[PDB]
Amino acid sequence: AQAGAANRSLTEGFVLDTMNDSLSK
Amino acid sequence: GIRVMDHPTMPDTQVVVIPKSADLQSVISVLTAKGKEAGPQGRNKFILLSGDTS
Numbered sequence: 001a002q003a004g005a006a007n008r009s010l011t012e013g014f015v016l017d018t019m020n021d022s023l024s025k
Numbered sequence: 026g027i028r029v030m031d032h033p034t035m036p037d038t039q040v041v042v043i044p045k046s047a048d049l050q051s052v053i054s055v056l057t058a059k060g061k062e063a064g065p066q067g068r069n070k071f072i073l074l075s076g077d078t079s
Contacts, residue, residue, distance in 0.1 A: 016041075016053060016071040018060025023053065023073075 026077060027052065037067035044077035 001008040001015075009015075015024040027047065032038040041056065043049050053073070060069040 010072070013075065014073040016056055016060075016073055018057045018069045018071065019064075021057050 026079070028079065032072065035070075037065045038070045038072060040072045040074065042074045042076075042078050045075070049073070049075075 001010055009024070017024060026044050028040075028042040030040050032040055041052065043052050056071050060071065
């Protein structure tokens with residue numbers, strides 16, 4: 001996950017939250 | 026094809042590989058099911074990779 005912001009998204013692939021049943025893009 | 030392995034650095038996260046043309050949504054559905062059936066100490070997350078990395 002890219003640092004330097006609160007919105008630390010991936011540069012490749014997705015993050016799946018199976019606790020809230022929600023996919024983060 | 027489809028692979029699943031523990032995250033090197035994140036005990037609470039696993040890594041999943043989904044090959045091209047595969048039904049990602051069906052794969053996710055399974056992950057969300059089993060992700061809650063057991064679960065780690067922390068919040069269960071998966072990292073989804075597009076393409077066959079084998």
